[PDB]
Each structure stands twice: as structure tokens, then as C-alpha cells.
């Protein structure tokens, strides 16, 4: 179906995260406990937001790199629907996270970082993982060159493997067209979805989403 | 001369506090492992900082992105050393090193993923001189102990001027394997706690004296 709107909560305290989530809930589909909030407060953040927003999809972004069986279980038990696992995790860790996700009826999302390869992506799909978080290339962000042909190509390759991407990195309404035809689960933003104009930004994103999906 | 480090990977702070208290007189470095960090948040770092004011304290975040903010949070909480994933973009690693410099702390690179010796040279060029080297997960899966592909990579890293922290089923009888490798710490978990932890620490100390400096 069409791409959903996801807010990444990266506040350094739970009181502020709870305030934001409360303010944005009526117009976001997915609420994410970002890695910053997760380290600031621990699994209490997940449980709290789970209780506050029971009808939202809830993500715990741990970028799990090792101890996957234990971390996956903790996050799922706390109430996460989806959790993130670093692409740099050993494939056995990734499998362990997946085993826990299947036990607990959650899902794994691969956070794409490091010297990752399409061989690696194929191994994720072979474990039955069908979600990845694709960040605008950092080199491109630093250089100011936007979303490059190479990033879009890589996203197309992943989509062709059956991976449903969450796309993130300076996402704004006027760039949505770029992702036409990419298998996209969500668009993820942070501050753009909060505050005075977050509601109108969400609506501007949805308008663009509806043109292309 | 290598120091002895305990990795606290308990899933609650009560248990970690009890373990830290039990082992503190024979370990040099106390580490808030990623598991405990995600379970409890930064209060784990600040609690252990308080309880053990003279130890070197590590916050094992395996930071992959949002490094300036995460690094600050950990150092503010009382960490002396923090870990950053090899999969972090070099700009993130640079951002963590900048905060570490500003807050008189240190960065350690957690070696995961498809990392390269070019990456390692980039870490050294930022002034980073520590990395965490884990016994190959494939070696563990096969049950075969340490292999020369790991030892050789550690010797290459040492030759670039990185002081390794070595972990993965470390036992006293294996310490001889690492002779000649610049080593900051040996890290273990359950082996350093409980009934036999003290005696194991003793043996590890004696083996360390036999091969360093
Ligand atoms: Mg995230
Ligand atoms: Mg058209
Ligand atoms: Mg560790
Ligand atoms: Mg006191």
C-alpha cells in the first residue's frame, strides 16, 4: 500500500519525547523511539510511548550490532512492533534477531550503514527480512548534492530484491517525486513533523505521496 | 600493560550494580555494555560512575549515527571511554572524536562489518588509538578457538598504532596468543564474576605480566 509518515523521536529526555509524540500523534502513522532517546532513557521510553499511543506502529531504533537475541527480545517485550538492526551486525546476529521477531510476531528493519553490499542485502532477504532503512548518502548530504543517481539506483536494486524501504535524510515534500517506483514503507523525518508547521508538512508529504503511489 | 575489563551486560541495573561491586577490587575497567545501556539508559552510566569513582568507565553504545549527541550524553553521564561502530560514517566518527577531545574522554572503535584496513588508517588519522577486536563469530559458531586470520588482522591494526581491547572467550591459557600485539585491555563478562572470577582475574594478570611490556 502507500508510504506512511514516520516521526523519529530523538529527544534526549522522555518528558520532551512524550510531549512531541502527543502533539504529532493525530497525523503520523509510525512513532519511532530513536537511538538517542533509547540510550537516554532505555526501554522505559518504548513502554511509555506504547501505553500512550496504542494504535500507532512503534519502532525501537537500536541499530543492533551484537547481542541481538537479548536486545530484540527486550524491545519487542517493551512493546516495539519493529526494531532496527545494523547492516554491520554479523549475519548470525541478524538471524538471531529474526528468530526472536518471528517468535514474538515483530519485524526487523535493517539500518543500512557501513561498507554494505548487495550480497549482504540478499542474505537479509534469505532470512525473510523485508525492510531496510535507507539514509541519504552522508557524502552527498555533506556536499549538498541532494539525492544522487547512485543512491536512487541502490534503492531500486534493493526494492527489486523485495525490500520495502523506509527513506530518510532531509525528506521534504518537493523531493517525494524522486522515489516514484521505489518500494517504500515509510518516509521518516524528525523536527519537520513537529512544532508549528509539522501538521502542514505531514499534509504536504501526504499530497505528494498520493500523486505517486 | 593490558588492563582487565568487565563488560556488564545485565538486563537490569540492580544486577549490574551487584556484579560491579563484587568484582571491583580486581578489575581495572568497568563497562556499561550495550544491553544494559538500552535496558536502563544513561542512569546506568551515572550510577556506576558514582559507585566506582576511580575506575575507568566505558559506555558501549556502538554508535553508528547521531554521534555528537550520543557522545556528549555518555561523557556527561560520567563515561571515560565510549564505543563507536566501525560502520559509522567517518564524519560521525570525527564528530564523536571532537566531543571526546572537548570533554577529555576517549573513543574506541568497535570492529564490526565489512571493515577495511583503509578504514582503520582513517581512524588513526583522526587521532583514535583504540579499537575493540572480537573473536570471529564464525570461529565461535564452529567452536574452534582463535584463528590466525584474527591474529593477523590484530597485528596489522597494532602496526598502525591502534591499541586493541581483545574479547571473545578470553581465558588465561590463551593470553600467550596475543604476545606482540599492542593491547589496552582484555575484556570478559561472566568469567570475571561469581565464584571463580577472582581467581580467573589473578591468572589473567599473571599471564599479562608474562608477555607485556
Ligand atoms: Mg531511526
Ligand atoms: Mg509522471
Ligand atoms: Mg562492549
Ligand atoms: Mg555519594
Number of structural domains found in chain A: 1
Q: Residue B71, Cβ neighbours under 10 Å: how many?
A: 27
Hey, what's the cell of B205?
594478570
The whole-angstrom separation of Cα A162 and Cα A158 is 7
Give the burial class of B138: count Cβ atoms within 10 A of its Cβ; 0-12 exposed, 13-18 middle, 19 or more buried.
Answer: middle
Best to test chain A binding among B15, B90, B113 (most A CBs inside 10 Å): B113
Q: Is the dihedral of CA A99, A105, A106, A107 positive or negative?
A: positive
Cβ contacts (< 8 Å) between A10 and chain B: which residues?
Answer: 66, 69
Q: Are the beta carbons of B134 and A88 separated by less than 8 Å?
A: no
Rounded to the nearest angstrom, the distance between the alpha carbon of B111 and the centre of ligand 3 is: 11
Residue A191 has which C-alpha cell?
523536527
Residue A46 DSSP SS3? helix
Name the DSSP class of A112: -
Q: Which residue in this structure is represented by grid cell 557522545? A: B71
Q: What's the CA gap between A80 and A60, in Å, rounded? A: 6
Q: Extract the annotated binding site of B for Mg(2+).
A: 31, 60, 110, 134
For the four alpha carbons of A108, A114, A117 and A123, in that order, the dihedral sign comes to negative
- What's the full length of chain B, in residues? 213
Helix or strand holding residue A90 (H, E): none
CA atoms of A152 and A4, how far apart (whole Å): 19
Please give the grid coordinates belonging to residue A8: 523519529
Residue ranges of the binding site of A:
32, 61, 111, 135
Grid cell digits, residue A133: 532503512
Tell me the technique behind this structure: X-ray
How far, in Å, CA of B94 to CA of A182, rounded?
Answer: 32
Domain that holds residue B111: 1-213
List the one residue out of B37, B2, B8 whose CA is nearest residue B188.
Answer: B8
User: Do B71 and B100 form a contact (C-beta atoms < 8 A)?
Assistant: yes
> Tell me, what CATH number does B202's domain have?
3.20.20.70
Tell me, in angstroms, the distance from the centre of ligand 3 to residue B210's CA.
Answer: 26
What does the alpha-carbon distance between residue B48 and residue B16 come to, in Å, rounded to a whole number?
Answer: 9
Report DSSP letters for B11-71, one per residue: SSHHHHHHHHHHHGGG-SEEEE-HHHHHHH-THHHHHHHHHSTTSEEEEEEEE-S-HHHHH
CB A192 within 8 A of CB A27: no
A140 CB-contact burial (10 Å; exposed 0-12 / middle 13-18 / buried 19+) = middle
Query: How do beta strands B3-8 and A107-111 pair?
Result: unpaired
- In whole angstroms, give the CA distance from residue B144 to residue B148: 12
Dist. CA A115–CA B5, nearest whole Å: 29
Q: With an 8 Å Cβ cutoff, are B11 and A70 in contact?
A: yes
CB B37 within 8 A of CB A38: no
3-state secondary structure of B80: coil
CB A94 within 8 A of CB A132: no
What are the residue ranges of helices labelled H in chain B?
A: 13-23, 34-40, 43-51, 67-77, 90-102, 117-125, 137-142, 148-159, 197-211
Interior angle at CA B34, CA B179 and CA B80, nearest 5: 65
Q: Which three cell numbers stand for residue B196?
A: 571463580
- DSSP lists the bridge partners of residue A132 as A110, A165
Q: Which three cell numbers stand for residue B153?
A: 588482522
What is the distance in A from the centroid of ligand 4 to the CA of A119?
A: 52
Provide the residue count of chain A. 213
Q: Which residues are bridge partners to A109 per DSSP?
A: A84
Using CA atoms, how far apart are residues B32 and A131, in angstroms rounded to an integer?
30
Q: Please tell me if residue B14 touches chain A, with a CB cutoff of 8 Å.
A: no
Q: DSSP letter for A121, please.
A: H
Pairing of strands B56-63, A164-168: unpaired
Written as nine digits, the cell of B106 is: 576517549
Are A39 and B141 an interchain contact pair (Cβ–Cβ within 8 Å)? no
HEC assignment per residue over A138-205: HHHHHHCCCCCHHHHHHHHHHHHCCCEEEEECCCCHHHHHHHCCCCEEEEEECHHHCCCCHHHHHHHH
Using a CB-CB distance cutoff of 8 angstroms, which residues of chain B are in contact with residue A140? none
N-term to C-term CA, chain B: 6
Cβ–Cβ under 8 Å, residues B87 and B113: yes
Instruction: State how far the Cα of A44 lies from the Cα of A18, in Å rounded to an integer.
Output: 12
Distance between CA atoms of residues A188 and A209, nearest Å: 13
Ligand nearest to the CA of A211: 2
C-alpha cell at B158: 597494532
**A114 → closest Cβ in B61, B69, B113:** B113
Contact partners, residue B49, CB within 8 Å, separation at least 6: B57, B77, B78, B79
A8, A53, A57 from A32: Cα distances, Å: 5, 11, 8
Paired strand residues for B130: B163
B chain contacts of residue A142, beta-carbon cutoff 8 Å: 91
State phi, psi for A56 to the nearest 5 degrees: -95, 155
Within an 8 Å CB–CB cutoff, is residue B92 touching chain A? yes
CA distance A166 to A136: 11
What is the sign, positive or negative, of the torsion defined by CA atoms of A46, B86, B133, A107? positive
8 Å CB contact between A5 and A193: yes
Helix axes B43-51, B67-77, angle to 10 degrees: 30
Amino acid at each position: 500500500t502507500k508510504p506512511m509518515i514516520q516521526i523519529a523521536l530523538d529527544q534526549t529526555n522522555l518528558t520532551d519525547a512524550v510531549a512531541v509524540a502527543s502533539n504529532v500523534a493525530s497525523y503520523v502513522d509510525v512513532i519511532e523511539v530513536g537511538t538517542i532517546l533509547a540510550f537516554a532513557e532505555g526501554m522505559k521510553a518504548v513502554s511509555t510511548l506504547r501505553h500512550n499511543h496504542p494504535n500507532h506502529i512503534l519502532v525501537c531504533d537500536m541499530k543492533t550490532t551484537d547481542g541481538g537475541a537479548i536486545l530484540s527480545r527486550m524491545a519487542f517485550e517493551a512493546g516495539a512492533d519493529w526494531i532496527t538492526v545494523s547492516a554491520a551486525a554479523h549475519i548470525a546476529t541478524i538471524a538471531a534477531c529474526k528468530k526472536v521477531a518471528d517468535e514474538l510476531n515483530g519485524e526487523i528493519q535493517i539500518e543500512i550503514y557501513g561498507n554494505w553490499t548487495m550480497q549482504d542485502a540478499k542474505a537479509w532477504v534469505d532470512l525473510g527480512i523485508t525492510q531496510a532503512i535507507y539514509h541519504r548518502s552522508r557524502d552527498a548530504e555533506l556536499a549538498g548534492i541532494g539525492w544522487t543517481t547512485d543512491d536512487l539506483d541502490k534503492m531500486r536494486q534493493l526494492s527489486a530484491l523485495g525490500i520495502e524501504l523506509s527513506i530518510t535524510g532531509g525528506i521534504v515534500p518537493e523531493d517525494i517525486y524522486l522515489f516514484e517506483g521505489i518500494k517504500t514503507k515509510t518516509f521518516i523525518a524528525g523536527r519537520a513533523l513537529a512544532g508549528a508547521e509539522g501538521q502542514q508538512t505531514a499534509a504536504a508529504l501526504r499530497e505528494q505521496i498520493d500523486r505517486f503511489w
